[PDB]
């Protein structure tokens, strides 16, 4: 199953590399730049999983109530496949009624980019119906991996959502805040 | 299947992003740094695909005849999923009979790390046998993707090989040299 393999890949090649040092990076950020931020960023990593697999090039553009505010201090890879590689993470502002309502580290789950591209490419042999099914199966698989993984205990949060195609009322901002507020 | 999704993820999440600008970066390096080099590093990215899925932490240690030379001046991602990740690429010299026989930018295919880890974890439900099967499938699928891909025409070489299991009449540098020699 492609989702099975992608979920494992996203854990083995990203999450288990980034999550162990995340809180420290955040705790650190909250010290050096507390006077600049005048706030605290939350300590979990929030992973957006849109099941329609639409991943915009700039999160800061997908909802106008989500603005980029800063990057986290960098981490350098000292491990197979990422030796001397530089990872950063972005911090975002969440707006409600034009005002900051929360601050968090936010990103889209990259394998969704792959699911979407496989549905667009002939050579992948992968239909739109294949895509939504595999996206749900990806999210369930990743949940199971995380629920029992040494690195992902209490520092990661999966935000899965399906855009009702009927209206444009849906708010990514509100969705994130729903999870945020606890 | 796992390998099929992984080859696509690897193309979509890495190769399509690093290949287009690779050839410019190597020509830049060839021209700017000709005094040091007294040679030309070759123009393609060479991708080690050990079928046993053994990826070391340190490439340079794998073979006494593969030696670190330099880093390629970097490239910062400017697309969906990769704003400001900094990729590091290394140039290596290949020795034959104690003498420099070639110079190329070399790395291991990261999804092999995932196939290996999947065969270690019981939750992934993946046997050692599945692993070899998927490794071959991964290489063949990646081949077919690259053959048709516009952004990866004449700038990429897959080096797939099988180490004799325990005895070690294997030279990684000979494997790389054999491909490089065209
Ligand atoms: C831009 C992009 C697109 C797709 C993937 C991906 O499918 C994928 C699947 C498994 C693991 C990774 C690694 C990562 O997210 O850094 C992946 O990265 C991708 C990236 C970085
Ligand atoms: C350390 C490590 C391990 C496994 C993968 C991976 O399976 C994988 C699968 C698809 C795409 C990527 C992205 C990349 O190679 O940068 C992947 O990256 C991995 C990395 C970076």
XYZ file of N, CA, C and O in Angstrom, chain B residues 14-151:
552
model
N 12.362 14.966 -3.490
C 13.770 15.261 -3.519
C 14.363 15.573 -4.873
O 14.913 16.594 -5.069
N 14.332 14.606 -5.754
C 15.004 14.692 -7.019
C 14.502 15.751 -7.953
O 15.265 16.420 -8.552
N 13.199 15.906 -8.070
C 12.668 16.955 -8.962
C 13.049 18.372 -8.455
O 13.025 19.345 -9.191
N 13.424 18.466 -7.179
C 13.768 19.734 -6.522
C 15.248 20.030 -6.540
O 15.664 21.179 -6.379
N 16.069 19.007 -6.693
C 17.494 19.232 -6.549
C 18.191 19.116 -7.892
O 19.233 19.746 -8.133
N 17.629 18.293 -8.768
C 18.229 18.063 -10.086
C 18.320 19.264 -11.047
O 19.354 19.427 -11.697
N 17.264 20.095 -11.151
C 17.313 21.121 -12.212
C 18.479 22.073 -12.011
O 19.142 22.458 -12.968
N 18.742 22.427 -10.762
C 19.783 23.395 -10.463
C 21.150 22.748 -10.223
O 22.148 23.425 -9.969
N 21.192 21.429 -10.293
C 22.398 20.700 -9.935
C 23.448 20.976 -10.965
O 24.592 21.278 -10.641
N 23.056 20.873 -12.226
C 24.025 20.988 -13.291
C 24.625 22.388 -13.340
O 25.796 22.544 -13.655
N 23.841 23.407 -12.997
C 24.408 24.752 -12.902
C 25.427 24.820 -11.761
O 26.520 25.372 -11.908
N 25.068 24.250 -10.618
C 25.970 24.285 -9.458
C 27.338 23.619 -9.698
O 28.366 24.046 -9.145
N 27.348 22.553 -10.495
C 28.593 21.840 -10.744
C 29.479 22.614 -11.746
O 30.725 22.682 -11.597
N 28.838 23.239 -12.734
C 29.577 24.095 -13.677
C 30.123 25.317 -12.985
O 31.243 25.732 -13.251
N 29.338 25.875 -12.075
C 29.841 26.969 -11.265
C 31.079 26.501 -10.523
O 32.120 27.123 -10.591
N 30.972 25.375 -9.837
C 32.102 24.836 -9.085
C 33.302 24.535 -9.985
O 34.444 24.808 -9.612
N 33.037 23.979 -11.169
C 34.107 23.639 -12.115
C 34.882 24.838 -12.602
O 36.067 24.755 -12.923
N 34.195 25.962 -12.668
C 34.801 27.152 -13.226
C 35.437 27.975 -12.134
O 36.579 28.407 -12.245
N 34.726 28.187 -11.062
C 35.251 29.005 -10.018
C 36.427 28.430 -9.311
O 37.286 29.140 -8.860
N 36.453 27.131 -9.199
C 37.354 26.451 -8.314
C 38.280 25.563 -9.102
O 38.695 24.551 -8.625
N 38.583 25.941 -10.323
C 39.416 25.124 -11.168
C 40.856 25.044 -10.705
O 41.535 24.067 -10.914
N 41.314 26.093 -10.065
C 42.656 26.119 -9.542
C 42.922 25.040 -8.525
O 43.977 24.471 -8.514
N 41.961 24.795 -7.656
C 42.103 23.857 -6.563
C 42.019 22.458 -7.120
O 42.861 21.598 -6.841
N 40.969 22.265 -7.908
C 40.527 20.965 -8.396
C 41.503 20.282 -9.342
O 41.768 19.092 -9.207
N 42.035 21.043 -10.296
C 42.880 20.489 -11.355
C 42.195 19.281 -11.967
O 42.781 18.212 -12.098
N 40.924 19.472 -12.304
C 40.118 18.453 -12.932
C 38.717 18.999 -13.054
O 38.493 20.190 -12.834
N 37.774 18.135 -13.411
C 36.373 18.514 -13.486
C 35.602 17.443 -12.772
O 35.741 16.259 -13.084
N 34.784 17.837 -11.807
C 33.852 16.883 -11.275
C 32.809 16.662 -12.373
O 32.476 17.589 -13.102
N 32.363 15.423 -12.519
C 31.300 15.071 -13.447
C 29.973 15.761 -13.159
O 29.734 16.241 -12.054
N 29.089 15.750 -14.147
C 27.908 16.611 -14.122
C 26.603 15.995 -13.611
O 25.591 16.691 -13.510
N 26.603 14.712 -13.294
C 25.362 14.102 -12.821
C 25.414 13.805 -11.339
O 26.480 13.640 -10.750
N 24.249 13.726 -10.715
C 24.186 13.209 -9.359
C 24.220 11.669 -9.390
O 23.421 11.053 -10.102
N 25.170 11.057 -8.677
C 25.252 9.584 -8.605
C 24.636 9.002 -7.328
O 25.024 9.338 -6.209
N 23.648 8.137 -7.517
C 22.807 7.694 -6.417
C 23.040 6.228 -6.118
O 22.644 5.334 -6.892
N 23.721 5.991 -5.004
C 23.966 4.635 -4.545
C 22.678 3.931 -4.100
O 21.951 4.432 -3.276
N 22.396 2.763 -4.670
C 21.254 1.963 -4.276
C 21.678 0.584 -3.893
O 21.478 -0.354 -4.678
N 22.278 0.436 -2.704
C 22.572 -0.921 -2.198
C 21.283 -1.700 -1.959
O 20.424 -1.276 -1.190
N 21.159 -2.840 -2.628
C 19.975 -3.681 -2.524
C 19.750 -4.282 -1.127
O 18.608 -4.518 -0.736
N 20.819 -4.540 -0.382
C 20.689 -5.009 1.015
C 20.079 -3.896 1.913
O 19.660 -4.150 3.042
N 20.022 -2.669 1.390
C 19.495 -1.500 2.121
C 20.386 -0.990 3.255
O 19.926 -0.233 4.111
N 21.650 -1.386 3.261
C 22.584 -0.857 4.237
C 23.127 0.500 3.826
O 24.025 0.607 2.991
N 22.582 1.545 4.432
C 23.124 2.891 4.325
C 23.939 3.269 5.554
O 23.404 3.280 6.660
N 25.232 3.578 5.372
C 26.056 3.988 6.521
C 25.758 5.442 6.906
O 25.152 6.195 6.128
N 26.206 5.838 8.092
C 26.105 7.225 8.517
C 27.074 8.077 7.727
O 26.771 9.206 7.353
N 28.247 7.510 7.478
C 29.336 8.209 6.828
C 29.778 7.487 5.545
O 30.428 6.425 5.574
N 29.410 8.077 4.416
C 29.753 7.525 3.116
C 31.272 7.289 2.946
O 31.689 6.204 2.534
N 32.080 8.299 3.256
C 33.542 8.227 3.096
C 34.214 7.020 3.773
O 35.304 6.616 3.373
N 33.564 6.447 4.789
C 34.150 5.335 5.555
C 33.893 3.981 4.917
O 34.604 2.997 5.196
N 32.868 3.948 4.064
C 32.419 2.717 3.401
C 33.495 2.056 2.545
O 33.548 0.827 2.424
N 34.341 2.885 1.942
C 35.374 2.401 1.046
C 36.655 3.242 1.226
O 36.621 4.473 1.220
N 37.802 2.583 1.386
C 39.050 3.362 1.442
C 39.338 4.086 0.117
O 40.089 5.054 0.080
N 38.762 3.602 -0.974
C 38.962 4.248 -2.262
C 37.945 5.315 -2.620
O 37.927 5.819 -3.727
N 37.080 5.659 -1.693
C 36.214 6.804 -1.920
C 36.572 7.845 -0.882
O 36.585 7.576 0.314
N 36.916 9.036 -1.335
C 37.442 10.019 -0.404
C 36.748 11.351 -0.541
O 36.462 11.793 -1.647
N 36.458 11.979 0.593
C 35.787 13.262 0.574
C 36.709 14.323 -0.008
O 37.868 14.417 0.383
N 36.162 15.126 -0.897
C 36.842 16.278 -1.440
C 36.249 17.577 -0.953
O 36.913 18.341 -0.340
N 34.995 17.834 -1.259
C 34.431 19.144 -1.046
C 32.938 19.128 -0.969
O 32.309 18.197 -1.369
N 32.371 20.208 -0.484
C 30.963 20.422 -0.623
C 30.705 21.216 -1.843
O 31.469 22.039 -2.209
N 29.613 20.935 -2.498
C 29.118 21.775 -3.571
C 28.524 22.988 -2.881
O 27.826 22.845 -1.880
N 28.789 24.183 -3.403
C 28.089 25.354 -2.877
C 26.581 25.147 -2.946
O 26.066 24.577 -3.910
N 25.887 25.603 -1.910
C 24.549 25.104 -1.631
C 23.419 25.656 -2.479
O 23.590 26.566 -3.309
N 22.260 25.054 -2.242
C 21.027 25.391 -2.919
C 19.902 25.392 -1.886
O 19.715 24.424 -1.135
N 19.160 26.490 -1.839
C 18.084 26.617 -0.872
C 16.743 26.491 -1.585
O 16.491 27.170 -2.589
N 15.893 25.610 -1.067
C 14.619 25.312 -1.697
C 13.602 26.437 -1.643
O 13.456 27.120 -0.628
N 12.882 26.617 -2.745
C 11.957 27.731 -2.892
C 10.647 27.238 -3.486
O 10.089 27.865 -4.394
N 10.170 26.106 -2.973
C 8.959 25.465 -3.475
C 8.118 24.955 -2.302
O 8.567 25.010 -1.151
N 6.908 24.469 -2.596
C 6.029 23.904 -1.574
C 6.739 22.791 -0.796
O 7.366 21.912 -1.394
N 6.632 22.838 0.530
C 7.214 21.826 1.396
C 8.696 21.995 1.721
O 9.229 21.254 2.557
N 9.373 22.952 1.076
C 10.822 23.113 1.274
C 11.358 24.551 1.320
O 12.460 24.822 0.834
N 10.606 25.474 1.903
C 11.176 26.794 2.071
C 12.267 26.694 3.136
O 12.020 26.256 4.268
N 13.486 27.031 2.716
C 14.660 27.169 3.582
C 15.204 25.919 4.300
O 15.872 26.045 5.336
N 15.079 24.820 3.680
C 15.776 23.661 4.068
C 17.005 23.926 3.333
O 16.908 24.484 2.308
N 18.147 23.505 3.831
C 19.390 23.720 3.113
C 19.926 22.345 2.845
O 20.192 21.591 3.773
N 20.024 21.993 1.570
C 20.594 20.708 1.170
C 22.121 20.743 1.052
O 22.696 21.650 0.450
N 22.777 19.745 1.619
C 24.225 19.647 1.500
C 24.609 18.520 0.546
O 24.164 17.387 0.698
N 25.433 18.835 -0.443
C 25.894 17.807 -1.347
C 27.394 17.717 -1.356
O 28.075 18.725 -1.427
N 27.899 16.496 -1.322
C 29.329 16.288 -1.240
C 29.924 15.778 -2.550
O 29.313 14.976 -3.256
N 31.135 16.248 -2.842
C 31.949 15.763 -3.948
C 32.993 14.771 -3.422
O 33.648 14.996 -2.392
N 33.156 13.674 -4.133
C 34.110 12.656 -3.730
C 35.110 12.337 -4.829
O 34.792 12.398 -6.017
N 36.313 11.955 -4.437
C 37.246 11.389 -5.426
C 37.239 9.879 -5.338
O 37.074 9.301 -4.261
N 37.345 9.244 -6.492
C 37.382 7.803 -6.547
C 38.759 7.313 -6.942
O 39.273 7.676 -7.993
N 39.356 6.493 -6.090
C 40.698 5.980 -6.341
C 40.682 4.616 -7.014
O 39.864 3.768 -6.713
N 41.632 4.408 -7.912
C 41.839 3.131 -8.545
C 43.347 2.906 -8.633
O 44.079 3.672 -9.303
N 43.801 1.855 -7.949
C 45.220 1.512 -7.914
C 46.007 2.659 -7.241
O 47.091 3.055 -7.676
N 45.418 3.231 -6.201
C 46.019 4.342 -5.492
C 45.924 5.722 -6.157
O 46.349 6.708 -5.574
N 45.362 5.804 -7.360
C 45.396 7.036 -8.155
C 44.002 7.567 -8.356
O 43.032 6.803 -8.408
N 43.896 8.881 -8.495
C 42.602 9.469 -8.792
C 42.075 8.998 -10.145
O 42.711 9.171 -11.170
N 40.899 8.402 -10.141
C 40.309 7.882 -11.360
C 39.024 8.642 -11.732
O 38.549 8.569 -12.849
N 38.441 9.348 -10.777
C 37.256 10.125 -11.067
C 36.882 11.048 -9.938
O 37.389 10.936 -8.828
N 35.962 11.953 -10.232
C 35.423 12.879 -9.240
C 33.944 13.133 -9.479
O 33.553 13.631 -10.534
N 33.126 12.805 -8.503
C 31.679 12.925 -8.690
C 30.961 13.252 -7.405
O 31.479 13.032 -6.322
N 29.757 13.787 -7.544
C 28.902 14.072 -6.401
C 28.036 12.837 -6.172
O 27.342 12.347 -7.069
N 28.098 12.329 -4.950
C 27.635 11.006 -4.636
C 26.714 11.061 -3.434
O 26.961 11.823 -2.510
N 25.650 10.262 -3.448
C 24.890 10.003 -2.237
C 24.071 8.727 -2.311
O 23.885 8.167 -3.380
N 23.623 8.271 -1.141
C 22.722 7.127 -0.975
C 21.272 7.495 -1.105
O 20.888 8.578 -0.702
N 20.465 6.593 -1.664
C 19.049 6.867 -1.864
C 18.358 6.694 -0.502
O 18.317 5.594 0.035
N 17.818 7.771 0.054
C 17.301 7.719 1.422
C 16.147 6.729 1.656
O 16.058 6.208 2.762
N 15.257 6.481 0.636
C 14.158 5.569 0.957
C 14.619 4.179 1.369
O 13.831 3.469 1.992
N 15.845 3.793 0.995
C 16.412 2.513 1.424
C 16.514 2.424 2.952
O 16.306 1.369 3.538
N 16.787 3.556 3.586
C 16.754 3.683 5.042
C 15.379 3.357 5.610
O 15.225 2.674 6.619
N 14.356 3.809 4.915
C 13.017 3.472 5.335
C 12.682 1.963 5.144
O 12.047 1.345 5.983
N 13.057 1.382 4.008
C 12.847 -0.061 3.788
C 13.567 -0.898 4.821
O 13.047 -1.913 5.304
N 14.784 -0.485 5.158
C 15.489 -1.172 6.201
C 14.723 -1.093 7.541
O 14.407 -2.110 8.172
N 14.403 0.126 7.953
C 13.686 0.335 9.207
C 12.342 -0.375 9.218
O 11.925 -0.906 10.240
N 11.649 -0.384 8.088
C 10.387 -1.123 8.028
C 10.553 -2.638 8.303
O 9.685 -3.305 8.879
N 11.668 -3.195 7.871
C 11.900 -4.604 8.149
C 12.333 -4.815 9.619
O 12.399 -5.937 10.066
N 12.676 -3.754 10.360
C 13.090 -3.881 11.786
C 11.928 -3.749 12.726
O 11.940 -4.268 13.844
N 10.905 -3.027 12.292
C 9.796 -2.757 13.181
C 8.647 -3.661 12.933
O 8.139 -3.693 11.832
N 8.185 -4.357 13.980
C 7.085 -5.295 13.819
C 5.773 -4.621 13.422
O 4.917 -5.239 12.815
N 5.591 -3.368 13.801
C 4.353 -2.684 13.453
C 4.196 -2.486 11.940
O 3.085 -2.413 11.448
N 5.307 -2.380 11.215
C 5.272 -2.138 9.766
C 4.934 -3.411 9.014
O 4.624 -3.351 7.832
N 5.008 -4.556 9.706
C 4.653 -5.854 9.142
C 5.384 -6.128 7.840
O 4.766 -6.386 6.813
N 6.711 -6.070 7.886
C 7.527 -6.083 6.692
C 8.681 -7.028 6.961
O 9.494 -6.774 7.827
N 8.775 -8.124 6.214
C 9.850 -9.091 6.422
C 11.174 -8.695 5.725
O 11.193 -7.846 4.814
N 12.274 -9.336 6.134
C 13.557 -9.161 5.450
C 13.461 -9.523 3.968
O 14.155 -8.965 3.104
N 12.597 -10.482 3.682
C 12.372 -10.937 2.318
C 11.609 -9.893 1.509
O 11.928 -9.632 0.343
N 10.585 -9.315 2.126
C 9.850 -8.226 1.501
C 10.817 -7.108 1.161
O 10.688 -6.429 0.134
N 11.803 -6.940 2.035
C 12.745 -5.853 1.892
C 13.585 -5.907 0.613
O 13.829 -4.872 -0.060
N 14.076 -7.104 0.302
C 14.903 -7.241 -0.879
C 14.016 -7.077 -2.124
O 14.417 -6.510 -3.145
N 12.802 -7.589 -2.012
C 11.842 -7.569 -3.095
C 11.510 -6.107 -3.407
O 11.504 -5.690 -4.561
N 11.258 -5.326 -2.358
C 10.873 -3.931 -2.502
C 12.060 -3.079 -2.942
O 11.892 -2.101 -3.661
N 13.258 -3.442 -2.500
C 14.438 -2.687 -2.908
C 14.580 -2.777 -4.421
O 14.876 -1.797 -5.075
N 14.330 -3.952 -4.991
C 14.519 -4.110 -6.419
C 13.436 -3.364 -7.167
O 13.663 -2.764 -8.226
N 12.253 -3.410 -6.590
C 11.088 -2.795 -7.187
C 11.275 -1.266 -7.182
O 10.997 -0.572 -8.162
N 11.773 -0.762 -6.070
C 12.090 0.645 -5.899
C 13.067 1.131 -6.989
O 12.854 2.169 -7.633
N 14.144 0.375 -7.190
C 15.141 0.747 -8.197
C 14.540 0.724 -9.638
O 14.738 1.616 -10.497
N 13.783 -0.305 -9.909
C 13.204 -0.379 -11.241
C 12.143 0.688 -11.525
O 11.990 1.150 -12.668
N 11.392 1.053 -10.488
C 10.364 2.068 -10.608
C 11.026 3.428 -10.744
O 10.683 4.244 -11.619
N 12.012 3.672 -9.898
C 12.731 4.944 -10.001
C 13.345 5.152 -11.415
O 13.252 6.229 -12.014
N 13.937 4.085 -11.943
C 14.459 4.062 -13.307
C 13.425 4.550 -14.322
O 13.696 5.423 -15.147
N 12.235 3.960 -14.266
C 11.171 4.293 -15.204
C 10.652 5.726 -15.078
O 10.306 6.374 -16.066
N 10.597 6.205 -13.846
C 10.231 7.584 -13.584
C 11.251 8.531 -14.222
O 10.881 9.451 -14.951
N 12.524 8.280 -13.971
C 13.605 9.147 -14.460
C 13.768 9.135 -15.954
O 14.166 10.140 -16.560
N 13.471 7.985 -16.546
C 13.551 7.856 -17.984
C 12.596 8.820 -18.701
O 12.940 9.382 -19.745
N 11.403 9.005 -18.140
C 10.392 9.867 -18.738
C 10.396 11.275 -18.186
O 9.684 12.138 -18.689
N 11.168 11.509 -17.135
C 11.090 12.803 -16.461
C 11.972 13.830 -17.141
O 13.162 13.564 -17.376
N 11.396 15.014 -17.441
C 12.093 16.075 -18.182
C 13.178 16.717 -17.325
O 14.279 17.020 -17.803
N 12.859 16.900 -16.048
C 13.730 17.587 -15.095
C 14.856 16.694 -14.592
O 15.487 16.986 -13.581
